[PDB]
């Protein structure tokens, strides 16, 4: 299908929503996740290049959305 997953949010035995980072394709093991202002989903900090919590007031976009804004030639 045109979707690897229906949503990057699964459910565990506890029924809790386990987030799946659309970057490395790994779930949240209780680490600091960053939510894109575009995707809104929760991505892992190391995979996106984050080492701590930045000002929430400041807008931030994941390597996909931040790229879709800057734009590449076409490679």
């Amino acid at each position: 299908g045109s979707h690897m997953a229906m949503a990057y949010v699964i459910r565990d035995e506890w029924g809790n929503q386990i987030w799946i980072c659309p970057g490395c394709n790994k779930p949240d093991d209780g680490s600091p996740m960053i939510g894109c202002d575009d995707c809104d989903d929760w991505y892992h900090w190391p995979c996106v290049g984050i080492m701590a919590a930045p000002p929430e007031e400041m807008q931030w976009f994941c390597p996909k959305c931040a790229n879709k804004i800057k734009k590449d030639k076409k490679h």
Binding site: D28, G30, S31, P32, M33, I34, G35, D37, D40, W42, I50, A53, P54, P55, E56, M58, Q59, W60
Partner: peptide, 12 residues
Amino acid sequence: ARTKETARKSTG
């Protein structure tokens, strides 16, 4: 930017 640390099982 929305950030959250669910490391409630860590001392830091």
